[PDB]
Amino acid sequence: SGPVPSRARVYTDVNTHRPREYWDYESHVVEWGNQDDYQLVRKLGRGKYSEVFEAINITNNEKVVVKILKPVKKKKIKREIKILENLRGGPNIITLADIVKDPVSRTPALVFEHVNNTDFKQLYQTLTDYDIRFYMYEILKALDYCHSMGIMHRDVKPHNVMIDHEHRKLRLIDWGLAEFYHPGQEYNVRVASRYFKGPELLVDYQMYDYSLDMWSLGCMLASMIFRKEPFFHGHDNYDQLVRIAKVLGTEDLYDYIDKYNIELDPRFNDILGRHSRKRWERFVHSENQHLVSPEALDFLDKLLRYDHQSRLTAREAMEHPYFYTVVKDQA
Numbered sequence: 001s002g003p004v005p006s007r008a009r010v011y012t013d014v015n016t017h018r019p020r021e022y023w024d025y026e027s028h029v030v031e032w033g034n035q036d037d038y039q040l041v042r043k044l045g046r047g048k049y050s051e052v053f054e055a056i057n058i059t060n061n062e063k064v065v066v067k068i069l070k071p072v073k074k075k076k077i078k079r080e081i082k083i084l085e086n087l088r089g090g091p092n093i094i095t096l097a098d099i100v101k102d103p104v105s106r107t108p109a110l111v112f113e114h115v116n117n118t119d120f121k122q123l124y125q126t127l128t129d130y131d132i133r134f135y136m137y138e139i140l141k142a143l144d145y146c147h148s149m150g151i152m153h154r155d156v157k158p159h160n161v162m163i164d165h166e167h168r169k170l171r172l173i174d175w176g177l178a179e180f181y182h183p184g185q186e187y188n189v190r191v192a193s194r195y196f197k198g199p200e201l202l203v204d205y206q207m208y209d210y211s212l213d214m215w216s217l218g219c220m221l222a223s224m225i226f227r228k229e230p231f232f233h234g235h236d237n238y239d240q241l242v243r244i245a246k247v248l249g250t251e252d253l254y255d256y257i258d259k260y261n262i263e264l265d266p267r268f269n270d271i272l273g274r275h276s277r278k279r280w281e282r283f284v285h286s287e288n289q290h291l292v293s294p295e296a297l298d299f300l301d302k303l304l305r306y307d308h309q310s311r312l313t314a315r316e317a318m319e320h321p322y323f324y325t326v327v328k329d330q331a
């Protein structure tokens with residue numbers, strides 16, 4: 001036969017219970033403003049699907065970010081917009097403030113609240129163990145919210161987390177890969193960034209769920225606390241899985257494959273090999289020990305599992321002892 005079906009352990013039917021217009025983004029009609037309200041100041045970054053500019057709203061002098069979309073499928077634009085609107089006001093979700101089209105070229109852009117991330121290379125290399133716990137909690141607040149709202153982010157990774165440390169402000173950004181979760185729907189595995197792709201995506205298991213975001217969360221925590229960017233440094237999609245096999249081991253991988261009756265690409269035959277599951281200690285050394293603790297390693301081990309159904313949910317994660325101290329201060 002073919003694969004064994006899978007359903008998310010939490011928020012399973014959340015979208016079944018909502019009215020249709022909530023998730024049927026194909027039919028959302030969009031209302032465009034004039035980009036001429038917004039004047040671009042400088043460029044902030046590029047990417048596969050967009051360029052991002054700092055801009056000024058000339059009607060109220062407010063500073064904003066304009067995200068000019070490169071040509072995506074028309075329905076992916078509706079999708080991102082509908083997701084952003086559904087999540088607007090949620091904890092640590094970037095707030096969408098406008099939808100405009102260039103008046104001549106007719107290119108669409110989204111307008112967001114500005115997050116000030118400048119002097120971030122300092123931030124990277126100087127977050128305390130406490131700050132990492134803090135910002136992990138902030139990320140998790142964003143993921144529990146969007147998962148509870150029936151939405152898979154699918155592209156969690158440091159570049160899609162914006163932090164303004166001066167104001168301990170974190171926003172989860174770029175929802176253009178996000179999808180609504182529906183039980184039984186088979187999704188596109190060609191999502192996320194290579195180093196953050198979950199095993200489900202690498203073996204072509206299409207019926208995945210919110211747990212994917214938590215595998216990605218796992219790869220950021222590991223690469224933060226070990227100081228190894230990226231943690232799983234694969235050289236293509238196939239070899240990405242080998243690199244995970246070299247840490248998680250092959251026994252658990254092949255048990256996962258068997259559990260879900262996954263057809264494994266015959267390419268993986270020769271390369272996956274035979275690998276023992278490593279202890280997290282072999283990634284510790286004097287330069288990163290200050291960020292590694294028993295709690296951090298228990299927490300991380302519970303995110304990086306082959307079987308998506310067995311990874312910690314966002315909510316379960318926020319309850320881990322790792323965050324005991326963060327939870328206390330918030331109060």
Ligand SMILES: CC(=O)c1[nH]c2ccc(F)cc2c1-c1cn(CC2CCN(CCNS(=O)(=O)c3ccc(-c4c(O)cccc4F)cc3)CC2)nn1
Binds near residue numbers: 123
């Ligand atoms: C791209 C895009 O659609 C976009 N759309 C927007 C909408 C509104 C807006 F205003 C801006 C944009 C942008 C947007 C994108 N950019 C450029 C990048 C430059 C690289 N940094 C990554 C470092 N992050 S960061 O907070 O230091 C960071 C991240 C994570 C951690 C971390 C970790 O990796 C692991 C554990 C704990 C952690 F905290 C640390 C720092 C992010 C911004 N600027 N604006």
Ligand SMILES: [Cl-]
Binds near residue numbers: 067173175
């Ligand atoms: Cl964005």
